[PDB]
């Protein structure tokens, strides 16, 4: 009831959220709240709770899970209470509620939640609860910020004569590596879980596993959108993502339409499976946007090389041939392609997703299907939108003008 109270219409309400955070986290009413700690016992997670009779009890999380599996009522009830507590905590931290986020981060660290997530002996739903808590408390915070897959502002001298996928990654690899150190273990766990899910047939067969994979896919989508995945890792992950959707505590908060082309100037019964498929589709759309960015960079590099060579007459035919090479006719761009079958797997997945009952999933599938065959037109339009600046001061002027115009 409290968890539903904090959030209304899937959007966090600041006032009631603040009141609930103050009341639950107040020094009083600590008996109701379960306490989680780490003990050397390497380290293990232990839960200590104060019973309504004022008799304190302590037990390891693994012991509680084993007892619940054996069918003991007390441990199962304690675990369910802990899950509802975790859901309430996650609702408290929704929409970057710093007041409660700070205290909850002090109470629960990244390592503890990662250990709980990676402890498969614990129940699947409990692991999903820790996945949700990790996504909201830690991954979504002040240091993390959204990224733009396509940048229409380029600097003439910074543009390399030749660009490669390795160079494209290395462009931002320093920042990505320095920011990914905290969540590197989480990324590895997510990748391992996705590989395990895709390896098994009929991945969406167990409801608890369905919830866990939905949480994992949400975490992966968040991390990708904050820019914590390199381009190469994204191309490696897209194959697995297509494999999962290969033909054989839920909040539906929607951000800016994922299925939107870059621009220079700006309740189903099985709804869990449909939502994870939709998240996978959003990830695939983001990957396609990064591919478009790489193609634009390649075109810009070719143009700059030709201009510098000609002007220390331009061979437009060679430029046209090079720009045609990327579109997938040749094997040079086979790396860019997100499918190993030449797009047959992607097209089949889109067709199998287009007739699903869920409406947002069908809309996304149709938009992706239409975007698939417009690679050339989209690339040309994106290149036309691109602007080149030879001075860094010009870049700063463009940035300030863009900010002012967007705000106005």
């Amino acid at each position: 009831y409290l968890s539903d109270l904090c959030v209304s219409n899937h959007i966090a309400i600041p006032v009631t959220q603040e009141l609930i955070c103050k009341c639950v986290l107040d020094p009083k009413n600590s008996d109701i709240l379960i306490r989680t700690e780490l003990r050397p016992v390497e380290e293990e997670v232990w839960l200590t709770w104060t019973d309504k009779n004022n008799e304190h009890h302590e037990k390891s999380v693994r012991q509680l899970a084993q007892e619940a599996r054996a069918g003991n009522a007390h441990d199962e009830n304690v675990l369910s209470y802990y899950r509802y507590q975790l859901k309430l905590f996650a609702r408290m931290c929704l929409d970057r509620q710093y007041l409660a986020i700070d205290e909850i981060s002090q109470q629960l660290g990244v390592d503890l939640i990662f250990l709980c997530m990676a402890d498969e002996m614990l129940p699947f739903d409990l692991r999903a609860s820790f996945c949700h808590l990790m996504l909201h408390v830690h991954v979504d915070r002040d240091p993390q910020e959204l990224v733009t897959p396509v940048k229409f502002a380029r600097l003439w001298t910074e543009i390399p004569t030749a660009i490669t996928i390795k160079d494209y990654d290395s462009n931002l690899n320093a920042s990505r590596d320095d920011k990914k150190n905290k969540f590197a273990n989480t990324m590895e766990f997510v990748e391992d879980y996705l590989n395990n899910v895709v390896s098994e047939a009929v991945p969406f067969a167990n409801e608890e596993k369905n919830k866990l994979t939905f949480e994992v896919v949400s975490l992966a989508h968040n991390l990708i959108y904050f820019g914590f995945y390199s381009f190469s890792e994204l191309l490696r992950l897209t194959r697995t993502l297509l494999g999962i959707i290969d033909c054989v505590t839920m909040v539906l908060s929607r951000k800016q339409s994922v299925f939107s082309a870059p621009s220079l100037s700006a309740e189903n019964e099985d709804i869990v499976v449909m939502e994870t498929k939709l998240k996978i589709l959003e990830i695939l759309q983001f990957i396609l946007n990064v591919r478009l960015d790489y193609r634009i960079s390649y075109l810009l590099s070719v143009f700059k090389k030709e201009f510098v060579e000609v002007f220390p007459n331009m061979n437009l035919d060679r430029i046209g041939e090079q720009a045609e090479a990327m579109f997938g006719v040749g094997k040079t761009s086979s790396m860019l392609e997100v499918d190993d079958e030449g797009g047959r797997m992607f097209l089949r997945v889109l067709i199998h997703l287009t007739m699903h009952d869920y409406a947002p999933l069908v809309s996304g599938a149709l938009q992706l299907l239409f975007k698939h065959f417009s690679q050339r037109q989209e690339a040309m339009h994106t290149f036309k939108q691109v602007q080149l600046l030879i001075s860094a001061q010009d870049v700063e002027n463009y940035k300030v003008i863009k900010s002012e115009l967007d705000r106005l």
């Binding site: 033909c247 046209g320 720009a323 199998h352 069908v362 809309s363 698939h372 417009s374 037109q377």
Partner: protein
């Protein structure tokens, strides 16, 4: 380097590329139309999705969702 010359060359290359790739875009759209014509061919014959596509499930769903 000259900014005006760079801009002029950028416009020239953009125009040349735009003129060059129109028939390829038209061919891609035609291939999309052809694929939409026979959606089942992509799927395996024994698959139920193939049967639905052959009977018009895909196109019927598209028509229903368009409105």
């Amino acid at each position: 380097w000259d900014y005006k010359n760079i801009i002029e060359k950028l416009q020239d290359i953009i125009t040349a590329l735009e003129e060059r790739l129109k028939p390829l875009v038209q061919a891609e759209l035609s291939v999309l139309v052809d694929v939409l014509h026979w959606p089942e061919l992509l799927f395996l014959e024994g698959s139920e999705a193939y049967q639905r596509c052959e009977s018009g499930g895909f196109l019927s769903k598209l028509i229903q969702h368009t409105k």
